[PDB]
Amino acid sequence: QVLFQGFNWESWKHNGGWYNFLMGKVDDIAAAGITHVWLPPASQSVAEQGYMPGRLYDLDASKYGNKAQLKSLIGALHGKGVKAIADIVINHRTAEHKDGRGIYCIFEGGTPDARLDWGPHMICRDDRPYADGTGNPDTGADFGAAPDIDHLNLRVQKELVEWLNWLKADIGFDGWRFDFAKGYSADVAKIYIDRSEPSFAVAEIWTSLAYGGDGKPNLNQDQHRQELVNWVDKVGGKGPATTFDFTTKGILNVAVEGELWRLRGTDGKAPGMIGWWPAKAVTFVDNHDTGSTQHMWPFPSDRVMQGYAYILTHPGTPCIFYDHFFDWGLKEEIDRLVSVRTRHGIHNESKLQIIEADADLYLAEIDGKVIVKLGPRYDVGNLIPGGFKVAAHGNDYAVWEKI
Amino acid sequence: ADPPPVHDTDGHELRADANYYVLSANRAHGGGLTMAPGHGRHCPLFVSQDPNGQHDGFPVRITPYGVAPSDKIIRLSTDVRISFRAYTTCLQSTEWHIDSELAAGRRHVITGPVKDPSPSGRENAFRIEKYSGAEVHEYKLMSCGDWCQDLGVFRDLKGGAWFLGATEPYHVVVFKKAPPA
Ligand SMILES: [Ca+2]
Ligand SMILES: [Ca+2]
Ligand SMILES: [Ca+2]
Ligand SMILES: [Ca+2]
Numbered sequence: 048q049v050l051f052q053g054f055n056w057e058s059w060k061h062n063g064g065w066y067n068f069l070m071g072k073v074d075d076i077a078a079a080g081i082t083h084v085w086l087p088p089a090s091q092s093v094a095e096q097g098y099m100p101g102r103l104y105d106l107d108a109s110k111y112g113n114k115a116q117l118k119s120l121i122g123a124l125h126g127k128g129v130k131a132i133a134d135i136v137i138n139h140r141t142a143e144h145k146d147g148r149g150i151y152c153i154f155e156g157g158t159p160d161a162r163l164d165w166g167p168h169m170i171c172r173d174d175r176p177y178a179d180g181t182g183n184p185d186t187g188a189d190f191g192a193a194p195d196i197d198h199l200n201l202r203v204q205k206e207l208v209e210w211l212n213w214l215k216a217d218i219g220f221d222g223w224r225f226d227f228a229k230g231y232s233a234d235v236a237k238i239y240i241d242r243s244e245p246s247f248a249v250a251e252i253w254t255s256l257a258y259g260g261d262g263k264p265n266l267n268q269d270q271h272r273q274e275l276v277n278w279v280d281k282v283g284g285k286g287p288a289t290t291f292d293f294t295t296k297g298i299l300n301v302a303v304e305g306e307l308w309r310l311r312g313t314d315g316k317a318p319g320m321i322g323w324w325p326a327k328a329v330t331f332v333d334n335h336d337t338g339s340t341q342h343m344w345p346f347p348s349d350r351v352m353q354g355y356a357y358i359l360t361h362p363g364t365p366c367i368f369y370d371h372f373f374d375w376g377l378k379e380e381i382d383r384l385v386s387v388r389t390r391h392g393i394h395n396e397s398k399l400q401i402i403e404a405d406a407d408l409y410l411a412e413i414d415g416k417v418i419v420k421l422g423p424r425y426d427v428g429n430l431i432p433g434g435f436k437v438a439a440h441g442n443d444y445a446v447w448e449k450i
Numbered sequence: 451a452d453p454p455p456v457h458d459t460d461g462h463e464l465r466a467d468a469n470y471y472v473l474s475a476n477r478a479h480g481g482g483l484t485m486a487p488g489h490g491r492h493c494p495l496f497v498s499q500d501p502n503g504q505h506d507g508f509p510v511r512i513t514p515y516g517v518a519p520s521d522k523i524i525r526l527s528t529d530v531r532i533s534f535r536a537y538t539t540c541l542q543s544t545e546w547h548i549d550s551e552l553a554a555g556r557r558h559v560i561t562g563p564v565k566d567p568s569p570s571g572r573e574n575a576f577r578i579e580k581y582s583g584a585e586v587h588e589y590k591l592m593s594c595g596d597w598c599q600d601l602g603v604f605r606d607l608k609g610g611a612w613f614l615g616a617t618e619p620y621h622v623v624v625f626k627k628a629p630p631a
Binding site: 171172173175176183184185186187188189190191192253254255256257258259260261262263265270300336340341342343344345 | 453476527556579581590607
């Protein structure tokens with residue numbers, strides 16, 4: 048399985064609707080071997096990109112397009128055999144009306160009835176000025192720009208699960224990506240995952256890595272990946288829940304610039320989440336926050352193919368970013384890499400065997416079928432066993448396949 | 451008043467006539483706040499974070515948004531202005547304010563004169579809030595001009611140092627009582 052993020056921070060501005068534009072990309076997306084497409088938040092939102100949702104049921108108000116266009120897009124993907132996952136933004140919500148205090152805290156679901164029609168009682172206790180102090184305290188981090196939803200309130204859970212089931216049954220989404228998952232407890236996420244029964248689910252849990260006095264990440268990042276593993280275990284290690292592997296992304300960001308030794312932990316295992324629980328980690332090079340037009344934690348631009356050579360051949364579930372595939376002229380190289388992974392049966396739990404990890408060389412063998420090399424090291428032929436032919440090579444990367 | 455007070459590491463409330471170091475709640479995230487040039491600019495200085503955990507940085511002065519003094523206590527969810535109580539080579543105001551321009555496509559909180567004042571003039575308005583619904587005394591800072599935006603620090607050394615700005619992950623802070631200056 049390989050994920051594809053089908054939008055960037057600028058998609059909402061697209062002339063003629065993003066859903067419409069994406070229709071012309073489905074043949075290419077399906078042909079590359081992509082199994083799941085992550086679509087942007089679909090509902091009405093004060094912020095154009097959709098991360099400040101108001102009327103959860105109002106899909107027609109989205110900058111990406113309307114409900115009809117969304118359904119056709121998902122229909123085309125399903126026909127092609129690819130699943131669609133929705134970006135679920137439920138830590139916070141924006142209110143439709145002002146209450147007596149003149150505070151925007153009266154919500155509206157987007158239907159003529161009372162579905163999702165909450166008030167300041169559903170807002171987390173201490174989230175000032177929005178809250179009326181009657182709700183329960185936040186189960187996780189607060190999101191500063193908007194009212195945090197009190198997920199301990201039973202009507203909240205009930206009506207949200209009902210919306211999730213609607214997204215699935217009516218719209219046709221197959222799974223979820225939980226935005227700002229650190230905003231509520233694993234217990235809370237468990238309720239939604241269990242009651243909506245998605246086929247796939249991935250949470251966004253982003254916390255700082257551990258740093259040294261030099262201003263760069265520490266060699267060991269166990270505290271960081273432990274936090275991701277702890278969440279998965281709480282929601283259900285046997286279910287469909289996974290987490291984005293921010294540990295690997297943070298390490299690869301700097302390893303790629305002449306410090307490839309960072310890619311081998313003391314135990315000879317991968318340093319990120321994939322080194323402990325690959326089945327539950329989804330790897331990536333950049334997303335709409337880290338890269339795109341936000342630049343929160345960009346991968347060195349000239350070395351992105353090294354990032355793709357790593358995640359596309361390694362354990363865990365890789366996620367390809369829109370821009371890199373279509374806008375950067377990397378499509379052919381990326382295509383080839385997914386093909387190598389697909390033909391050899393490499394999956395989220397493939398065995399990783401790190402052969403070398405020098406400053407200028409990272410050499411690893413996976414499932415005894417594929418060997419990947421990152422780095423400028425010119426000749427490494429002496430290190431690659433017999434019965435291995437070059438399958439792909441590019442700027443500071445090469446991959447060999449057996450037979 | 452209504453909002454609970456902000457507490458320092460010794461459990462006492464924050465006073466508007468005292469200096470405090472703004473440290474990371476988890477030392478793995480680095481040391482205290484300070485000022486540093488970067489991104490090609492010599493001045494004004496950006497609000498930076500010292501990567502070294504043992505470094506307390508520069509003491510800060512937190513003040514109720516201009517016309518709000520009362521009991522000298524600093525409370526949560528309330529407009530506040532912040533200044534580094536330190537001397538700089540730029541010889542400019544050492545008060546914080548959100549930048550109107552992007553540096554490397556990122557919005558940072560800087561120091562010195564407000565280049566392009568908004569009609570509201572709220573570039574220098576900040577707020578201290580609890581990071582989560584937990585009882586622990588761990589906070590986060592927000593820039594509140596038009597809307598409130600949580601602040602985090604760019605730790606990738608782009609521009610020459612770690613800088614405070616509008617970005618994830620939000621920086622979870624703790625306040626240590628600093629000596630008078
Ligand atoms: Ca309604
Ligand atoms: Ca909030
Ligand atoms: Ca976010
Ligand atoms: Ca929350």
